[PDB]
Scaffold this active site. Structure first.
Site, mmCIF file in Angstrom:
data_model
loop_
_atom_site.group_PDB
_atom_site.id
_atom_site.type_symbol
_atom_site.label_atom_id
_atom_site.label_comp_id
_atom_site.label_asym_id
_atom_site.label_seq_id
_atom_site.Cartn_x
_atom_site.Cartn_y
_atom_site.Cartn_z
ATOM 1 N N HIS A 1 55.396 21.289 -55.503
ATOM 2 C CA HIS A 1 54.859 19.484 -55.906
ATOM 3 C C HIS A 1 55.985 18.775 -56.822
ATOM 4 O O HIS A 1 56.685 17.813 -56.273
ATOM 5 C CB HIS A 1 53.667 19.285 -56.174
ATOM 6 C CG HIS A 1 52.513 19.742 -55.078
ATOM 7 N ND1 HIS A 1 52.756 19.464 -53.683
ATOM 8 C CD2 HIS A 1 51.422 20.226 -55.010
ATOM 9 C CE1 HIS A 1 51.657 19.555 -53.145
ATOM 10 N NE2 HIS A 1 50.893 20.179 -54.037
ATOM 11 N N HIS B 1 53.367 26.975 -56.242
ATOM 12 C CA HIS B 1 53.106 26.192 -55.375
ATOM 13 C C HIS B 1 52.944 24.582 -56.088
ATOM 14 O O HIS B 1 53.668 23.481 -55.535
ATOM 15 C CB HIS B 1 51.489 26.251 -54.881
ATOM 16 C CG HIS B 1 51.048 24.881 -53.865
ATOM 17 N ND1 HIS B 1 51.200 25.145 -52.356
ATOM 18 C CD2 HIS B 1 50.411 23.814 -54.391
ATOM 19 C CE1 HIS B 1 50.576 23.868 -52.278
ATOM 20 N NE2 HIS B 1 50.133 23.258 -53.163
ATOM 21 N N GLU B 2 52.267 24.515 -57.327
ATOM 22 C CA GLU B 2 52.331 23.341 -57.874
ATOM 23 C C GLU B 2 53.765 22.843 -58.534
ATOM 24 O O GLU B 2 53.795 21.735 -58.202
ATOM 25 C CB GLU B 2 51.359 23.460 -59.091
ATOM 26 C CG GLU B 2 49.947 23.617 -58.854
ATOM 27 C CD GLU B 2 49.171 22.374 -58.482
ATOM 28 O OE1 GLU B 2 49.881 21.116 -58.478
ATOM 29 O OE2 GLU B 2 47.955 22.119 -58.094
ATOM 30 N N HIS C 1 52.610 19.334 -48.867
ATOM 31 C CA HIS C 1 52.008 20.252 -48.217
ATOM 32 C C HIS C 1 52.930 20.228 -46.863
ATOM 33 O O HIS C 1 52.841 19.436 -46.267
ATOM 34 C CB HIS C 1 50.618 20.234 -47.976
ATOM 35 C CG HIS C 1 49.918 20.331 -49.456
ATOM 36 N ND1 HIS C 1 48.714 19.612 -49.609
ATOM 37 C CD2 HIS C 1 50.009 20.892 -50.594
ATOM 38 C CE1 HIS C 1 48.251 19.838 -50.866
ATOM 39 N NE2 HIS C 1 48.886 20.815 -51.276
HETATM 40 C C1 LIG Z 1 39.993 27.046 -56.741
HETATM 41 N N1 LIG Z 1 41.081 26.870 -56.310
HETATM 42 C C2 LIG Z 1 41.811 27.929 -56.220
HETATM 43 C C3 LIG Z 1 41.080 26.167 -54.718
HETATM 44 C C4 LIG Z 1 42.530 26.025 -54.120
HETATM 45 N N2 LIG Z 1 42.577 26.125 -52.865
HETATM 46 O O1 LIG Z 1 43.982 25.541 -52.880
HETATM 47 C C5 LIG Z 1 44.230 25.019 -54.371
HETATM 48 C C6 LIG Z 1 45.556 24.641 -54.395
HETATM 49 C C7 LIG Z 1 46.643 25.024 -53.469
HETATM 50 C C8 LIG Z 1 46.801 26.616 -53.181
HETATM 51 C C9 LIG Z 1 48.242 27.157 -53.093
HETATM 52 C C10 LIG Z 1 48.313 28.166 -52.279
HETATM 53 C C11 LIG Z 1 49.479 29.137 -52.649
HETATM 54 C C12 LIG Z 1 49.587 30.393 -51.951
HETATM 55 C C13 LIG Z 1 49.664 30.151 -50.307
HETATM 56 C C14 LIG Z 1 48.437 29.327 -49.839
HETATM 57 C C15 LIG Z 1 48.442 28.097 -50.714
HETATM 58 C C16 LIG Z 1 45.513 22.790 -54.344
HETATM 59 C C17 LIG Z 1 46.860 22.344 -54.362
HETATM 60 O O2 LIG Z 1 47.199 21.936 -53.078
HETATM 61 N N3 LIG Z 1 47.370 22.001 -55.481
HETATM 62 O O3 LIG Z 1 48.744 21.375 -55.500
HETATM 63 N N4 LIG Z 1 43.128 25.237 -54.991
HETATM 64 ZN ZN LIG Z 2 49.223 21.511 -53.388
#
Ligand SMILES: CN(C)Cc1noc([C@@H](CCCC2CCCCC2)CC(=O)NO)n1
Ligand SMILES: [Zn+2]
Ligand SMILES: [Zn+2]
Length: 201
Positions: A97, A93-94, A103
């Protein structure tokens, strides 16, 4: 939610990277897996940084909002990897970005496909749900992708276990589409990244 900014596309899809200290080998393996996952399905490539001005740094520190989207000009951009955000799915996911995606649930057309429940978002995390202005996104003819690794789950950053931050509007194959369940690139992610990076067939 592919960036509309040409200057934010990594030239030739080459993304130089540095891994900071303080990570375990186990954690470093996850970074490689996530980078390989992108490399295997698109023309994006990750290179150990030498003298390039723009590069990504996997940085050992608490998880937090908000990652830079696309290539920042003229200096490095940190990816925050902490104890709670070091699994494969989150890193993939990161890296989304990094390659230039906001998103999915912030696409300019998102209110046709989902409802955000802003009351239920944790204070300070609403940045992650704010709709992109239409000039900031060029979707490249691709439709809203409920399966995207860039799409949150129904309760991502929710104030409580049983409260939703995101509710899909309509049914697909007889149910509301599952969102934020996958931990790998979707078919839609790949198709769209290929158009964004002008990848050969
Ligand atoms: C503690 N922490 C885990 C909470 C959290 N909730 O979301 C996020 C990040 C995106 C989560 C990606 C996820 C991948 C799998 C499908 C659903 C979304 C925050 C973010 O957007 N980082 O860029 N951190
Ligand atoms: Zn994100
Ligand atoms: Zn998309």
């Amino acid at each position: 939610a592919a960036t509309s900014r040409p200057e934010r596309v990594w030239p030739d899809g080459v993304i130089p990277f540095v891994i900071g200290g303080n990570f375990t080998g186990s954690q470093r393996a996850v970074f490689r897996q996530a980078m390989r996952h992108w490399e295997k399905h698109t023309c994006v490539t990750f290179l150990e940084r030498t003298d390039e001005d723009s590069y990504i740094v996997f940085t050992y520190r608490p998880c937090g909002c908000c990652s830079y989207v696309g290539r920042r000009g003229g200096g490095p951009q940190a990816i925050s990897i902490g104890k709670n955000c070091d699994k494969f799915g989150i890193v993939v996911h990161e890296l989304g970005h990094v390659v230039g995606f906001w998103h999915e649930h912030t696409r300019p057309d998102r209110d046709r496909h989902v409802s955000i429940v802003r009351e239920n978002i944790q204070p300070g995390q609403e940045y992650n749900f704010l709709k992109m202005e239409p000039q900031e996104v060029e979707s490249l003819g691709e439709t809203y992708d409920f399966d995207s690794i860039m799409h949150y789950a129904r309760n991502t950053f929710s104030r409580g276990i049983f409260l939703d931050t995101i509710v899909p509007k309509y049914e697909v194959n007889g149910v509301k589409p599952p969102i934020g369940q996958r931990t790998r690139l979707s078919k839609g992610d790949i198709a769209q990244a290929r158009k964004l990076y002008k990848c050969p067939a």
